Subunit: 82 residues, 2 copies
């Protein structure tokens, strides 16, 4: 059940660490984990990013996931509510 | 489906004054967070060729067939 992001966040740090990715991440940021192939989970994650924006100071970092692993990271420039 | 969803985004950008915040030149990545079959192909397409820069990406996060949020790219990072 959506709670899973805890696990996926784990898989994310293994990459950030044992894959030298931390370098491109901001000192302070808010991580939005979006499992592109797990709708029930990805939708929950965006909900919390919405009913809790928090832009600069703690800019957003999107981690796009596929089959339980990170595939790409989007480093926030700006966000736009549609 | 992206073609159709692309149309839905256009109404929004236009008939809802969003064009304002999009850059003059860019490549739109349309991501239906609730349609795995479609979101995955959209990502594959974006994983294709561009060159370290060129045309900035704009991600259109979709839900129930309509855009819910736009991410204006600063930088991208590939993991693999």
């Amino acid at each position: 059940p959506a709670e899973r992001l805890a696990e996926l966040d784990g898989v994310l740090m293994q990459y950030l660490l044992e894959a030298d990715l931390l370098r491109e991440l901001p000192p302070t940021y808010r991580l939005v984990l979006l499992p592109l192939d797990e709708p029930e989970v990805a939708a929950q994650a965006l909900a919390w990013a919405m009913e809790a924006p928090n832009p600069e100071g703690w800019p957003s970092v999107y981690a796009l996931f596929l089959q339980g692993r990170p595939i790409r990271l989007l480093l926030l420039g700006k966000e736009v509510e549609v």
